[PDB]
Design an enzyme around this catalytic site. Structure first.
Site: not given
Ligand SMILES: Nc1ncnc2c1ncn2[C@@H]1O[C@H](COP(=O)(O)OP(=O)(O)O)[C@@H](O)[C@H]1O
Ligand code: VO4
Ligand SMILES: [Mg+2]
Ligand SMILES: Cc1ccc2c(c1)C(=O)[C@]1(O)CCN(c3ccccc3)C1=N2
Ligand SMILES: [Mg+2]
Length: 703
Positions: A179-180, A184, A224, A227-228, A448, A450
């Site tokens: 997670s985080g 996404t 996060n 978070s999705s 992810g 968690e």
């Molecule tokens: N390549 C990126 N560039 C800028 N910020 C990012 C990047 N990847 C992740 N983030 C930051 O981390 C946060 C969590 O990433 P996310 O993709 O939502 O995580 P998850 O793996 O839980 O889907 C995002 O909302 C953003 O603030």
């Molecule tokens: O915090 V993420 O892995 O989107 O559920």
């Molecule tokens: Mg996500």
């Protein structure tokens, strides 16, 4: 050509900065170095020491402060510094944990978040914006082979795309991470890239799907801020010529429970806050809305705002997206009525009547919910507190007490929200479903791995999905690769890379002996079962028997599973009810009679409202989970997979703060170093007999 021009944005933001003359001096040094632990109980905190002498079996080195000695077999040597910042870590001379981490660290300190690790991409979350996703960056990557350009999510996206055209084979991009970590965000970059390079309105609608899905399906957790709380597999569809022809979103089970409960510091789904912040003056009057503090489903966590986010601005982005995708004005208004209605339902306060049965003394929220949903409040009231059920074949009105009435109301809320979510997705797909595909590239973005203070049934399903995904990586990288070598007799000795999630998988989802989920389902149709007979049954089957299970001594309502990513303790409270996922039929009858065109679809459209049977019982959540997982895994087996391993730098959601223990735990359980070693030690490429290399029974293999 910006690739060869050292003044370009490409060079500035994607390439390692030129070292200076002091660095060159250091780079041509004869000195040699080792990575060591100042404290041997902290095996992930390393410093660099100069090797000052050796015997045939040992090194002696200087510490940062005293000399020490280590066996050569236990030594983590530091790579020559010319390797610092290398784009593909399969090139390192010394492949060990501190050396891999150090290379990621050198890149990350320069905002280079992408690094190859043999055949797959590692992505370390920057937690800040980096300008490497512009159209100009897109144009540089188009058509380039992987070794021609710097590491980037765009490059792996292009490789998949060229493989789809050249091999006439569907591809998948599997983005892993806790997670985080960045799944996404990377997913969205893949879709952006593909839509640009293969593009010809449709492309805009593909992109605008995302703010809608995120508003309804994402929330702040402690891990996060975005978070999705549902997983998805996005099929980007292409015609025979390679142009984008459509897209289809498979969504997986939503964490509906978050609608009615959030842990301290978390939020409900973003849409709730977006509506309350963003709604027109008398939009708020027509829906009887106030601020979040006024609603039980928004006022319990202590958090209504996320740092750096304007929920009013986000609401405008969500509505613009709904316009582009093609939801009508009446549809949007009905969607928002459902959101408002849910908040009113949450404000209903049941009280003890003269007897054991509940009553509703104040009907303000009931009445406001009923108005916006277009249902009859008297019928709703009766359906909440006095639902009719069968006792044998007799029809008996119950009179639920406060706790049962409240749980029923919650059930109705969760069903409304989860059905609305499904309906949004179905409406989106119908718009993106315009041509039968020739080919697809699927991008997988699960929830992810968690761990929270309190982990429930949702967490087990999330973490199991992650374990299965890691097993899929293991299968493709190590098991299938060596099975091929060995069937083709290329003189290979099998290597046990020591990554096998099978034991944990069998514990959770085994059939004989039955795993956790099978025992849950059995308990779920057993009339006398309780959460305590459930936990007793799990301990009876697994305690002191299964090596991945732990019956803790500190609790009678928890059990432990050792996942690839670590041990998790799961609290059993409410699992039977979560698994059965009941909703009183009289509540359905109430909402089937709604005057609202969207509400009525949620309750009468069988694809949204009907629930499958197995024998005399509705399908459980666990069986639905399993069907969805087996469906994904079947699709993946028909694709050529590409892996991106997203890595979270710390547990604070902060930039410029790469934490040793946090990252190394991920590099280890992900199998990164094992993955680099199979790439180096093995034979990636092979061809039927074509008309540092080897000869198979039917194929030539090489590197
Ligand atoms: N390549 C990126 N560039 C800028 N910020 C990012 C990047 N990847 C992740 N983030 C930051 O981390 C946060 C969590 O990433 P996310 O993709 O939502 O995580 P998850 O793996 O839980 O889907 C995002 O909302 C953003 O603030
Ligand atoms: O915090 V993420 O892995 O989107 O559920
Ligand atoms: Mg996500
Ligand atoms: C392939 C697959 C199958 C099922 C899934 C998931 C992915 C998820 O990521 C989730 O959508 C994230 C939440 N979740 C879930 C929610 C409640 C109960 C069970 C699972 C999930 N189930
Ligand atoms: Mg505890």
């Amino acid at each position: 050509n910006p690739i060869h021009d050292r003044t370009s944005d490409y060079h500035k933001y994607l390439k390692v900065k030129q070292g200076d003359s002091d660095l060159f001096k250091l780079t041509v040094s004869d000195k040699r170095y080792i990575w060591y632990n100042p404290d041997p109980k902290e095996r992930d905190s390393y410093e660099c020491g100069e090797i000052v002498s050796e015997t045939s079996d040992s090194f002696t080195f200087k510490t940062v402060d005293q000399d020490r000695q280590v066996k050569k077999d236990d030594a983590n040597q530091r790579n020559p510094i010319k390797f610092d910042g290398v784009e593909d870590m399969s090139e390192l001379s010394y492949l060990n944990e501190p050396a891999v981490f150090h290379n990621l660290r050198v890149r990350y300190n320069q905002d280079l978040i992408y690094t190859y690790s043999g055949l797959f991409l590692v992505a370390v979350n920057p937690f800040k914006r980096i300008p490497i996703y512009t159209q100009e960056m897109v144009d540089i990557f188009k058509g380039r082979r992987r070794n021609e350009v710097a590491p980037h999510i765009f490059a792996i996206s292009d490789v998949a795309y060229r493989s789809m055209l050249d091999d006439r084979q569907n591809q998948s991009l599997l983005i892993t991470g806790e997670s985080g970590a960045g799944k996404t965000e990377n997913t969205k970059k893949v879709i952006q890239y593909l839509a640009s390079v293969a593009g010809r309105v449709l492309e805009q609608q593909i992109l605008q799907a995302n703010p809608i899905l995120e508003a309804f399906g994402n929330a702040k957790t402690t891990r996060n801020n975005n978070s999705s709380r549902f997983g998805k597999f996005i099929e980007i569809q292409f015609n025979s010529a390679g142009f984008i022809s459509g897209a289809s979103i498979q969504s997986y089970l939503l964490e509906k429970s978050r609608v009615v409960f959030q842990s301290e510091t978390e939020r409900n789904y973003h849409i709730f806050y977006q509506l309350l912040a963003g709604a027109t003056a008398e939009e708020k009057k027509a829906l009887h809305l106030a601020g979040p503090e006024s609603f039980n489903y928004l006022n319990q966590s202590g958090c209504v705002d996320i740092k750096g986010v304007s929920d009013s601005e986000e609401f405008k982005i969500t509505r613009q997206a709904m316009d582009i995708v093609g939801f009508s004005q009446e549809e949007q208004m009905s969607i928002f009525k459902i959101i408002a209605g849910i908040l009113h339902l949450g404000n209903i306060k049941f009280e003890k009547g003269a007897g054991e049965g509940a009553v509703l003394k104040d009907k303000t929220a009931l009445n406001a919910a009923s108005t916006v949903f277009g249902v009859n409040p008297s019928v709703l009231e009766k359906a909440l507190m006095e639902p009719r059920i069968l006792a044998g074949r007799d029809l008996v009105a119950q009179h639920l007490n406060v706790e049962k009435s409240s749980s029923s109301r919650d059930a109705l809320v969760k069903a409304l929200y989860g059905r609305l979510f499904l309906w949004l997705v179905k409406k989106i797909n119908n718009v993106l479903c315009q041509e039968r595909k020739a080919y697809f590239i699927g991008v997988l973005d699960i929830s992810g791995f968690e761990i929270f203070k309190v982990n429930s049934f949702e967490q087990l399903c999330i973490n199991y999905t992650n374990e299965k995904l890691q097993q899929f990586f293991n299968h493709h990288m190590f098991k299938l690769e060596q099975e091929e070598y060995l069937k083709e007799k290329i003189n290979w000795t099998f290597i046990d890379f020591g990554l096998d999630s099978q034991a944990t998988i069998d514990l959770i989802d085994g059939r004989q002996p039955p795993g956790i989920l099978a025992l849950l389902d059995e308990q779920s149709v057993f009339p006398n079962a309780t959460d305590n007979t459930l936990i007793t049954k799990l301990h009876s089957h697994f305690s002191k028997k299964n090596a991945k299970y732990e019956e803790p001594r500190f609790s009678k309502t928890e059990f432990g599973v050792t996942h690839y990513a670590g041990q998790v303790m799961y609290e059993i409270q409410d699992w039977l009810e979560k698994n059965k996922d009941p909703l009183q039929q009289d509540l359905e009858l109430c909402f089937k009679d709604s005057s609202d065109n969207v509400v009525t679809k949620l309750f009468n459209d069988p694809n949204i409202a009907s629930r499958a049977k197995k024998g005399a019982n509705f399908i459980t959540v666990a069986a639905q989970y399993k069907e969805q997982l087996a469906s994904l895994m079947a699709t993946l087996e028909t694709t050529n997979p590409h892996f991106v391993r997203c890595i979270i730098p710390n547990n604070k959601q902060l930039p410029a703060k790469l934490e040793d223990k946090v990252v190394l735990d991920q590099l280890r359980c992900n199998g990164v170093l094992e993955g680099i070693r199979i790439t180096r030690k093995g034979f990636p490429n092979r061809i039927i007999y074509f008309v540092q290399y080897r000869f198979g029974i039917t194929k030539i293999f090489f590197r």
